[PDB]
Design a protein around this ligand. Structure first.
Ligand SMILES: COc1cc2c(Oc3ccc4[nH]c(C)cc4c3F)ncnc2cc1OCCCN1CCC(c2ccc(C(N)=O)cc2)CC1
Ligand SMILES: COc1cc2c(Oc3ccc4[nH]c(C)cc4c3F)ncnc2cc1OCCCN1CCC(c2ccc(C(N)=O)cc2)CC1
Ligand SMILES: COc1cc2c(Oc3ccc4[nH]c(C)cc4c3F)ncnc2cc1OCCCN1CCC(c2ccc(C(N)=O)cc2)CC1
Ligand SMILES: COc1cc2c(Oc3ccc4[nH]c(C)cc4c3F)ncnc2cc1OCCCN1CCC(c2ccc(C(N)=O)cc2)CC1
Lengths: 196, 176, 194, 195, 196, 196, 193, 175, 175, 176
């Protein structure tokens, strides 16, 4: 269940809920699996915040186990194309595709809470895709192009060269928020700003 | 009992490939060819085939067991011999490959699946390429056709009537 | 989730959501599978935007695996009947039917973001259709007619001959955004404006 | 979700509507699903309200449909012809089986199709199996033929063909391109793209 | 199955329902299983209440069987990052991840109703996860890091040495409200404030 | 389809439904099975009714088959903590957990309608719970603690010794409203107030 | 699909739907199965209507196949507790628990339409309940008390002796609207206007 | 069909023709116990057409082969993969054969983890023991260095009959 | 087929190859009964490749083994777990064997609780009884302390053939 | 075949109750006792029991057939004899009721179900009270205990070890 709250100024009373309020401060939440729905909803949010005001930053919170591959590159391309800066923040976890999106934040504005974990691995296929060998040879070729595209774009945003990414994502690689800064996925680890 | 006729026929050196080609049928059939070679290594063995196809791995147990046997293996296509059945028909002993008159031959390229990671799928794909090269070479040997035509015809299913299968080289004779 | 936001003017306070805002700016989103419903939804969107202002352009964003064939040709005939120009944008993927719709935008206004992929393959049937052979001969004939229409209408918009299309789609053909422009499916690859 | 709303504004007030309410506002009915009992009543109610709001102006039925049941056809059909207002039919994409009969039942001169639409004609089928004593199936089999010959004579009425011909074209399915549907007598004009 | 009610002042008539009202008083309710949805819903709530007023307290009612782990640490990092203090209350039950959340409340502000029970055990995996040994070798390493992290943050808030926690969480440990105070999971057990 | 109705006063026209009107007069309905959803919804309503006014009584109509245990004790502890007195009224039935609540209403305001029945039994576990013996021995120990917490709180509220409850609940014990009064579960059996 | 309508006065315009208007005239509809949900909805409806005005009649329309036993008796005891008289009308059918509600309306205000049917049978259990004999011996006794409570409270409103109800409910007993009046379940069979 | 496997069992031929489970492994160890009791100097031929199976079932079969007084010839028919490759390569030195178009696959073990974080750690401890011991045994059988076994076995590695002879899995290719 | 195992019974060899349930257990007790009747002085060799199973079923086999006139040799092939470890360790002392790469698993009992609070109380009473009794018995077979059986068994303890021989589950390892 | 071992043991006058006692095992089992008494009516029948319980109707079929047989019935509790297993072990011929040393005996009261109309259920419930009284009486005859203790111990499952079972009266000897 998810409450609504009510805010007020001399102009009028506004009823809104926790996710609209975050959006009102140019904050998008990426917290489900990046599937095709998820991707369209997030581009539409990005594009809208670009239209409402292109000179203020957009921030993306990430608690996501990853998602599809064409879905990733849509979100990725929208993030770079938009004029506004993008702050990416990982709470808890950013894995697989989601890990690439954390690193694809604009430099200096990629951060993660201290107990976040970041996982990186190369595209997998949970299903089986069936066909004449002619057809599987084609998909098999594209699956490899998709893999190297994940590895070169990670190299662009982390500073590791592509050849290490491939050694590193051969088997899954979990990194703690601190390990994730040394690797180059994020730029800062958020300190608990609490008095206690 | 259906297996009562198949065993009495075994005494007549007649064996059947009547189902889809899986490890279970291949293992029984490799067993039978060994036995029939043990009983007599100079009388032929006749292999009737009415099969839609099946596993290449299981088909190559059969094929090698045919080739290495001391006696000849006559093969007969009744009804339908397709894919791996088509290969095993054409792999019979030369001169001893028969098609019954209204049998049909189907030849096409391998099917399979991909699954796993991006690195795991790359390996699967390497074997696709080898296996397909290695299977076209063997069909090209059996039939006498060029690799270049085997590959081109096999892209999508190519059907043969008993007669067309003889001009092509799958069989050596049509029974009457 | 998908939040809504609130806009304000000297006229009034307006609450809307991201897809309403996109439609307000003449953007239609085709980002699911093209089935009969989705297609009727898009035609209604096209015709409504043609009604509000036929001298202004409509934009269709495309991140779609494609869809049925008669569904494609409804959406396609509607795009070409409307007077208003149509700009198409491929954001992630435009495959099968959707790649045809990307190519069918009005010339010069077909584009893709840099890492978008385009897939072109000929009509398939994942199901099975069964009947008397006389029944299957009729359907098999129409599947051939439908195939050759995709190949001739792709050609009208890419500038290739239909015979080239028919061979490129014999087996699926995946294209990068730049390769989609070379092919003639789109006109430009959008550069990051950041 | 998949279908946005838009806002129109005038000196009178601000109106929020969505693509099918705007279309209903212009006397356009959309028949784009499978005709079942639901679809049919939803469509009759729409036809009758539009006849009440103004009986002297045309109604448009957009059609992109794979068909549906028989008594749902004959209900929708009967309403189209009872209403005093003229009915303009437009086929986008497809009008098949039962849907092709209603495309043809629009008022003459005002039945149209977009150029790449396909129109399908076949005789009633029953995908289920209905069971009973031979006496009951004899009755059911009887009505099933009445349905076929009724589909065949009303198709004949609007196309100008004879029912003995209708009955031959429908023995096996008959797919017609937009142009072929004009020659057959099902639509009157094929819209040319006005870009 | 849940009424709505209507409040009134000189300013206007307000319709709200029981959880909205509770949100109005800065109370967040965590009473379902902590899954990924739940977790985003609760960070969103924590952050908004921190935005509306960072100097006024946040209260989290907890009647929960626990939930996933990356979802645990997200909520935990937010609890500790927000500037407002957080008072935690265990009604009925706080188990697994939820028992760590009870303890991470800002000190002095952890309570439990008298017949609340608090359960603590080490991360378990109810499914099966499959692969090459090289892959399972990696998951098993992260599953052990997950256990020691639950044990050192529990140690951080309870004051126990982490080596004691690890022995106690080897098998399930049920604690009554009072046992939880002695253990160091809460600070106070609410007295019934009823005159009758 | 549950009708809605409209009330009117010189101040404004109000549309509400039967459960809202019942809530407006501080009557909470507990008429489903007590699961965690239900329990939070009822605990929230109790806490809300205490905020609008703690010097007014709250009434809990009960026609419920009972439910889980930690949900019972969540609800129980709230009912006792709240300052407001509580009227419990059984329509139809109060079984297992539901009957502890009926008894725990504040003294003198526990009642039942005449053909209402009250059922009492010791906690049961319909599932099967599995593990190494070491774990079941733990589970088993808590199930008995739970059993005796039910015997002791019922005794507090019926005036019986727990050792009698434990005998009466060994096998199920159905009580009519009058027999429930005699037992000490309620205070009065409502008489029909009809002028017919 | 169930339409909504618009009614109008000098005060304002009201949109409501056919069950709200029926509730507005103190008509409660009991037209589903009596399960625990259904029972709670009707108790709130009955109690609310008593709060809006205790000196006016409540009418219960009944076309219901019956329902659970503790849900019958909650409804019944509420009906009898409320100060307002309750008029019951059987529209289609009132079977099992529902016929007990038809009969429990206030005397003189129990009716049925002419083609309505009333079914009376003794409690059944469609499920199976399993257990030790000691536990089944207890349930079996509560089930027998339930049967006899149905037989005696029906006996209270129909004027038949409880012993006949028990002879008559041994096997189902279906009644027409007229036959329901002679049995004593309804007081009048509505004449078509 | 089982009438052929009995006629062949009299000629000292047995098959591992399916997936390796306790059931096929037990009927197989029993068949080798009987066949060494009838005659302990004539070889046993074990023809293998197998995709793999349980490591525990395969150690029953593997231990039983080795303690046999007589020799065990192993023949790769069609395909001997994973645990099948292990049992082919465990055949007596000199008497491991590959048919010409057989295929051999080598890879590392697979499995699952479930349970508490303490139970999973134990599970993983055995994963490592088991992995080191199976590579050591492949290393002894093939003549390769342990380092190359662990390396080649990271993911599926396919061999044709010809490459299998170079690597050390078999000693001959039948013709 | 089924006849391979029957030829082996003629030689006084029997298999425990599946999970130990009432069905395998009963056939196995019958087999030991017959074999003691045919000859009450010649050994019975009991080969074990079993993941474990029911105690009550397992205690039938154990009681019948101990009371049988002849000795019962136990051989652990590949894997002897849970009741498999118990029935292997319960073989006649001096005649308990493990093949070189078999593994033995020892751990504590599993089950469920269900029903009323009072029925579960009864269930848990038997859990303690059962566990204390199964531990005393493993301690007799192995010679280890009750102290160490209970502690090692809390979660699964795997032993390789050698580790098992030091621990006391077997007396020998075959070569 | 498993059945080949159970027949080799029938010739030695051994029969097993190795499963739940349902009608089928009860009929095969009464038949085995009729055969074994027709062959020779002076030699014992040994009934090994490793059983969890089952139907009383099927189980009273077995009990009567034991008691009416001419020969004695020795009973062996192997591993487990619970509920009707406990009744049939304890109903063995006095003096020939045995327990293997690590067997367990379970005793509890009938379990069952009720369904249907209020009158039908009343009938179901009378038979419950009868059936409950008849079983306790029989177990009180077998064990020597007062009916009052059988009823008290059987309310909820009461477990016995072989040794405890001998003190209680379910068996007469522990084998060693
Ligand atoms: C028959 O299995 C497989 C056989 C293979 C194999 O065999 C041989 C052996 C000797 C051989 N000598 C020659 C000359 C060729 C030749 C051969 F080729 N050689 C190489 N590699 C193979 C992989 C297989 O597959 C295994 C992975 C798991 N796996 C996933 C999906 C699968 C699948 C299968 C069918 C369909 C379908 N219709 O969707 C979909 C999926 C199948 C298996
Ligand atoms: C095969 O059982 C198991 C065998 C084990 C085992 O054997 C031995 C024995 C002697 C041995 N001597 C040598 C030198 C090695 C060696 C060995 F290694 N030694 C240690 N511990 C084991 C755990 C198992 O697990 C058993 C639970 C039930 N269970 C079965 C299969 C499961 C599973 C899951 C996923 C796949 C998949 N693709 O995901 C397949 C199975 C999951 C759970
Ligand atoms: C094996 O049955 C049971 C055996 C029992 C039993 O036997 C003996 C006998 C002689 C014995 N001499 C010695 C020294 C020990 C010893 C013994 F111990 N002595 C006492 N009480 C038992 C209860 C059982 O339980 C039966 C209920 C029905 N039932 C419920 C759940 C079940 C279950 C649930 C979950 C799994 C799973 N993975 O979840 C498997 C089963 C199985 C059966
Ligand atoms: C076992 O059949 C039944 C046998 C009965 C029966 O036999 C005899 C005969 C001679 C007997 N001499 C003595 C001294 C006792 C004695 C006996 F007793 N005598 C009386 N009346 C019986 C009712 C039955 O019941 C049948 C209803 C349908 N029905 C079947 C099974 C049901 C059920 C329910 C729950 C489980 C739950 N876990 O398992 C299993 C079954 C529920 C309903």
């Amino acid at each position: 269940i998810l409450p609504s709250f009510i805010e007020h100024s001399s102009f009028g009373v506004k009823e809104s809920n926790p996710y609209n309020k975050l959006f009102e401060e140019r904050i998008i939440f990426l917290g489900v699996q990046v599937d095709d729905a998820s991707a369209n909803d997030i581009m539409a949010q990005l594009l809208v915040l670009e239209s409402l005001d292109p000179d203020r930053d957009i921030t993306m919170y990430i608690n996501s186990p990853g998602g599809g591959f064409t879905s990733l590159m849509a979100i990725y391309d929208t993030m770079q194309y938009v004029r506004a800066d993008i702050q990416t923040v990982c709470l808890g976890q950013a894995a697989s595709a989601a890990a690439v999106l954390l690193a694809a934040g604009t430099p200096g504005k990629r951060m993660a809470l201290p107990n976040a974990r970041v996982l990186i691995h190369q595209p997998s296929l949970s299903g089986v895709i069936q066909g004449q060998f002619s057809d599987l040879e084609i998909q098999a070729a594209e699956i490899e192009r998709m893999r190297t595209l994940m590895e070169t774009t990670l190299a662009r945003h982390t500073g590791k060269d592509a050849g290490v990414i491939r050694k590193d994502t051969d088997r899954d690689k979990i990194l703690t928020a601190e390990e994730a800064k040394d690797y180059g996925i994020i730029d800062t680890v958020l300190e608990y700003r609490k008095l206690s | 009992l259906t297996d009562s006729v198949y065993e009495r026929l075994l005494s007549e050196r007649i064996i059947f490939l009547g189902s889809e080609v899986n490890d279970e049928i291949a293992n029984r059939l490799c067993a039978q060819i060994l036995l029939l070679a043990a009983e007599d290594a100079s009388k032929d063995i006749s292999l009737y085939i009415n099969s839609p196809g099946g596993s290449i791995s299981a088909g190559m147990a059969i094929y090698d067991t045919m080739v290495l046997a001391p006696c000849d293996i006559a093969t007969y296509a009744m009804g339908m011999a397709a894919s791996m059945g088509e290969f095993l028909l054409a792999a019979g002993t030369k001169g001893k490959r028969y098609a019954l008159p209204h049998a049909r031959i189907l030849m096409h390229q391998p099917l399979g699946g991909v699954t796993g990671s991006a690195a795991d799928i790359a390996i699967q794909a390497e074997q696709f390429a080898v296996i397909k090269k290695e299977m076209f070479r063997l069909n090209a040997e059996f039939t006498g056709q060029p690799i270049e035509r085997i590959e081109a015809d096999s892209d999508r299913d190519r059907w043969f009537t008993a007669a067309e299968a003889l001009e092509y080289g799958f069989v050596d004779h049509i029974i009457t």
